[PDB]
From Swiss-Prot, chain A:
Belongs to the protein kinase superfamily. Ser/Thr protein kinase family. Autophosphorylated. This is AP2-associated protein kinase 1. The chain holds residues 956 to 961 of 961 of the full protein. It comes from the Eukaryota. It is found in: Cell membrane; Membrane, Clathrin-coated pit; Presynapse. It comes from Homo sapiens. Interacts (via CBD domain) with clathrin. Interacts with AP-2 complex. Interacts with NUMB. Interacts with alpha-adaptin. Interacts with EPS15 isoform 2. Interacts with membrane-bound activated NOTCH1 but not with the inactive full-length form of NOTCH1. Preferentially interacts with monoubiquitinated activated NOTCH1 compared to the non-ubiquitinated form. Detected in brain, heart and liver. Isoform 1 is the predominant isoform in brain. Regulates clathrin-mediated endocytosis by phosphorylating the AP2M1/mu2 subunit of the adaptor protein complex 2 (AP-2) which ensures high affinity binding of AP-2 to cargo membrane proteins during the initial stages of endocytosis. Isoform 1 and isoform 2 display similar levels of kinase activity towards AP2M1. Preferentially, may phosphorylate substrates on threonine residues. Regulates phosphorylation of other AP-2 subunits as well as AP-2 localization and AP-2-mediated internalization of ligand complexes. The gene is AAK1.
Curated annotation (Swiss-Prot), chain B:
It is found in: Postsynaptic density; Presynapse; Postsynapse; Cytoplasm, Cytosol. Disulfide bonds: none annotated. This is PDZ and LIM domain protein 5. The modification Phosphoserine is found at S2. Interacts with various PKC isoforms through the LIM domains. Interacts with actin and alpha-actinin through the PDZ domain. Interacts (via LIM domains) with SIPA1L1/SPAR; this interaction may occur preferentially with isoform 1. The chain holds residues 1 to 84 of 596 of the full protein. It comes from the Eukaryota.
Amino acid sequence: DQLIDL
Amino acid sequence: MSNYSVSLVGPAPWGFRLQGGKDFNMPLTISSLKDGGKAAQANVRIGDVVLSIDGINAQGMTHLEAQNKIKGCTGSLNMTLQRA
């Protein structure tokens, strides 16, 4: 859905 | 398809992104690595499939469930993965 940095 | 384990030393950020999960109809997969981040330092590679997170099989997990297990991980991040 979106680019989420972990 | 050979498997390996990591135990990344905290704190997060862990230095990676995921794609997939049950709600995306694909296995959870390492999809980006931060240059020099902790996942890259453990030789995690883009395309590797996440088989378990903290001992919990990843197969049933949604994208958000995996993200939150990773994000909210206390101490080291233990995962097993399958090489692409």
